[PDB]
Write a protein that binds this DNA or RNA. Structure first.
Lengths: 350, 197
RNA sequence: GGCCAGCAUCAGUUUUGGUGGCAGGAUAAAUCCAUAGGAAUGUAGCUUGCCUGGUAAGUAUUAUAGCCUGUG
RNA sequence: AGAACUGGCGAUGCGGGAUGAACCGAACGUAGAGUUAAGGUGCCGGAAUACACGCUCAUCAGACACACAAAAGGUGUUAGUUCAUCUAGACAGCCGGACGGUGGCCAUGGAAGUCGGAAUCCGCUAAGGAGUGUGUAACAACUCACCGGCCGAAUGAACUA
RNA sequence: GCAGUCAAGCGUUAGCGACAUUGCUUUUGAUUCUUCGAUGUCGGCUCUUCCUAUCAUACCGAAGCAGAAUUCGGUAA
RNA sequence: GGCAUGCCGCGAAGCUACCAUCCGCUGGAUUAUGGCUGAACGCCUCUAAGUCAGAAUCCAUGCUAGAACGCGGUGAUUUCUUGCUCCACACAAUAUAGAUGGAUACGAAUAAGGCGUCCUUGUGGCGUCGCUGAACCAUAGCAGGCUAGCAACGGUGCACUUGGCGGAAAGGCCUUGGGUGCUUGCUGGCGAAUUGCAAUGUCAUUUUGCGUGGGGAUAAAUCAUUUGUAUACGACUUAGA
């Protein structure tokens, strides 16, 4: 009979870092343009979407169905550097790293720990080398062109722009899908300090996989028949695959929550706000199902590492309405207008 | 006589080469091995695979984490065979093993350095013609060594560079030989010839 | 006025090389020379079909090579 | 199971046998020199990865208290014995003959040789089975048992290690 | 098993003996209504680990296997 | 308002659920099996040589952890503990799994190759070599002195300087320009003693510290408060010049 879990997931010691490191990246298709392999963000909360589907041969074909969906915060991102790797018998080794020298205070805080007590002796000294006519970054580009057949770009999250006010941002590597590494490095150099749009990397109905750290539960350490004669739960990296993206959330403008059917002008911000989270005011991605971890936990979005031709991925969504009632209790209305209509005027109104 | 000797694994028997390397190491002789992926083992491929699988089963019965690592790299496999020949659990064995180094392919700066072979260990010389033999590279690839393709490109590049260097050396030596022939018939040349040169 | 070594030759144990003269075999035997013969895995030559100038067995037991046998 | 008899341990050190209280050797004070028994001379392991005649492909050979699952069997290998084929053309490979009474006699819708079954003849020759098989309602259709046309020098059968 | 039978081979070379072989081995799918002194602690829960002399799934194979479905040899833990 | 976790209906939240929801991979090598070519044996043949398709089998793709004693890159590294670091030498102690000339670089085949040559550039012809590296350089001066010239103007140590190549651990190699020593390639003027018939007779550096003098830089994390996504206890992630 089965056992108390999967032996491949044991031992289950605590994760070495809150941020889930990417184990692998999708194969580099040279014929495709210079796109982005993955993205990083913080998940806000859960919501319910009611929609119909075009699924011929299914019992619920042409019938409206409600499925669990989640909203992940993903504000605009700016590239901070580029990293190249060379294949070796010991594996892929980092050749050299480059920086634009135009690093925001967020990455400086991330690098340091006691920023308030820190003297703020940032990269300025090294930047002074770059703050010239050049020929240094040109040398780095030449080195990464002659070698480093695989290039990974470095980006940092706009933690300051996140609804949950914070000063320290996360940093992680992201690969490219473009042609020969010449185009990759040229695009990376041109895109230094340039804003990155989430919608440019994903699209509706796209199948994606994500990695995150599950909720911790503290110490979790009876039958006296275990050994023959002849202690932690949660707070570990976990992966999930085959997640359908229903719609790209352009949360910097109204009408994102309402669909073409309901057109109930409002934002996806649940009444009162997300539990233990702020108020979304920037770009976000809508993905069905659920992702490990809790609110404010960093998550990574990847396109499954491979292309899928199954009809499930091909099928397109027909969102009719998105639920945004107050999750802080037994919510009954989507916007204050509905609550006022139901209850009418109140003492506070006069 | 040389302080350091580089042995090419290509076309060499694992057992004899390992035995001679271990014997030389115990006498205070630095030895380094290159192109270990090109090493060969007698017998047919299936027999070698079955023999290797037998060692894989061996491990710590109850604690399946501290058992001897079942290395997949050809260099590590070659080192493991030499380990059993030397007194590993001794100070002398540990000291001798330090002098020994094994790498897949020919990484620098050993690429520029001279390479030699062991006449009493050549597979082509000692193994009878027609006898089945197995290449260590194939076994490594079959046992999860996902690095054969990576080594191939570096080996090809090094071979091209060495071919260019050999062409330059041949061009120089042709002129050297022409000059030596021109210098012949001189009195010093006659004296050298009469004195064994 | 002693202790530790080197050098030359010494007596015992012992190890590894060089060299000369003798006795024994079939008074070693092969090899070498002479003598009369035999054969082919036929030597020169001759002979027949083919064809650039070789080829095959037919003859040829030593001839423009040699072998063996018996004896001295 | 039981008898007389021999050796060792008993009372025992030492070299080797991975190690074995019964194995091989071996006359036990303290040191030096040189030669050996047993085991060997690829490493642990001190000694030739020595010569020479052959075998061994083994999916875990082989280095195994030698004891029995052990008798054969392998279109696996190496070496040998006997009996015949033979230039009155050695075995094997391509082509034809394979007849005539006859479709034998009894069984009977059909057994023309190949669903039943007794002998299997005589005529005839280089040779022909009242049939070896493949397949037919009934022959019919094709092969060899046996022979010849070409080849072209050793071949087939039973045993032993 | 016993007692033979044929006799590949070994034989004091009269005897042995491999494989087959005959007799125990309610002929009308009837009913035996049969289930005969185990002197011993083991028996059953959960989970793990190992074998294949493997039930399903998987692999292919031989069948009066036309399909459905069925009989069986083998690979595979 | 306390009291009898007194209770009642609701009740977030702590726990937690087939008693709720989202997902649960794809390329090769094989077993048995079906074949190819083709012997073995003048036939034949899936096997002896190779090879095709081929199992939930095997390897990786993917997933969890990560050598707590593996690795690469990146930023900084103390202004009055003036403390610290690089480089030229300056004395010491340290110890060398053990210097006592030189790791001298094609690859492929081993029933075949390297070199020069001819063209027709060929899987070509000719000559040349292996049958060991017992090979090539270099090796003369106090562990290598003080000097005179001869002809070459070559060989080479040394700091600058020009460009190129090298990322598998590159940290290495070649080279443009002269400058400064050696030159035993050749011939001469001198010291060798006494270190007593031998007592390795050292002149190789590994690291560390203080000194001179030309430059170089002006940080950290923890303690503590706080926070809670972490949370038995520890650890850990946030915020305050």
């Amino acid at each position: 009979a089965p056992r108390h879990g999967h032996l491949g997931f044991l031992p289950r010691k605590r994760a070495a870092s809150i941020r889930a490191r990417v184990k692998a990246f999708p194969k580099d298709d040279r014929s495709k343009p210079v796109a982005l392999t993955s993205f990083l963000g913080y998940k806000a909360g859960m919501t319910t979407i009611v929609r119909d589907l075009d699924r011929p041969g299914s019992k619920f074909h042409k019938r409206e169905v409600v499925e669990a969906v989640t909203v992940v915060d993903t504000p605009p991102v700016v590239v901070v550097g580029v990293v190249g790797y060379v294949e070796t018998p010991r594996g892929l080794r980092s050749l050299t790293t480059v920086w634009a020298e135009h690093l925001s205070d967020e990455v400086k805080r991330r690098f340091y720990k006691n920023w308030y007590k820190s003297k703020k002796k940032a990269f300025t000294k090294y930047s002074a080398k770059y703050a010239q006519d050049g020929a240094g970054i040109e040398r780095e580009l030449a080195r990464i062109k002659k070698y480093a057949s695989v290039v990974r770009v470095l980006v940092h999250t706009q933690i300051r722009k996140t609804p949950l006010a914070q000063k320290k941002a996360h940093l992680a590597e992201i690969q490219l899908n473009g042609g020969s590494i010449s185009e990759k490095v040229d695009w990376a150099r041109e895109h230094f300090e340039k804003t990155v749009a989430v919608d440019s990397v994903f699209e509706q109905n796209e199948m994606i996989d994500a990695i995150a750290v599950t909720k911790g539960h503290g110490f979790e350490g009876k039958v006296a028949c275990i050994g023959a004669w002849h202690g932690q739960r949660g707070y570990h990296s976990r992966t999930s695959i085959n997640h359908k993206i229903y719609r790209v959330g352009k949360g910097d403008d109204e009408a994102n929550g309402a669909t073409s059917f309901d057109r109930t002008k409002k934002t996806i911000t649940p009444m009162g706000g997300f539990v233990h989270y702020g108020e979304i005011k920037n770009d976000f991605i809508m993905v069905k199902g659920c992702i490990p971890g809790n609110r404010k936990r960093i998550v990574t979005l990847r396109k499954s590492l491979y292309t899928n031709t199954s009809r499930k991925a091909l099928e397109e969504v027909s969102l009719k309405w998105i639920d945004t009632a107050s999750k802080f209790g037994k919510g009954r209305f989507q916007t204050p207008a509905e609550k006022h209509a139901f209850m009418g005027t109140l003492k506070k109104d006069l | 006589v040389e302080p350091v000797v580089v042995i090419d694994g290509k076309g060499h028997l694992v057992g004899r080469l390992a035995s001679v390397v271990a014997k030389q190491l115990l006498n205070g002789q630095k030895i380094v091995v290159v192109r270990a992926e090109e090493l060969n083992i007698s017998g047919e491929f299936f027999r070698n695979k079955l023999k290797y699988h037998d060692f894989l089963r061996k491990a710590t019965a109850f604690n399946k984490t501290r058992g001897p690592f079942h290395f997949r790299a050809p260099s590590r496999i070659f080192y493991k065979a030499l380990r059993g020949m030397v007194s590993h659990k001794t100070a002398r064995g540990k000291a001798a093993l330090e002098r020994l180094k094994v790498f897949e392919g020919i990484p620098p700066p050993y690429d520029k350095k001279k390479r030699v072979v062991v006449p009493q260990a050549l597979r082509v010389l000692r193994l009878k013609p027609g006898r089945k033999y197995t290449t260590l590279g194939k076994l490594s690839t079959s046992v999860g060594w996902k690095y054969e393709d990576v080594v191939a490109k570096l080996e090809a590049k090094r071979k091209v560079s060495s071919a260019e260097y050999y062409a330059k050396k041949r061009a120089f030596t042709k002129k050297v030989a022409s000059a030596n022939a021109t210098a012949a018939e001189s009195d010093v040349a006659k004296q050298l010839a009469a004195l064994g040169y």
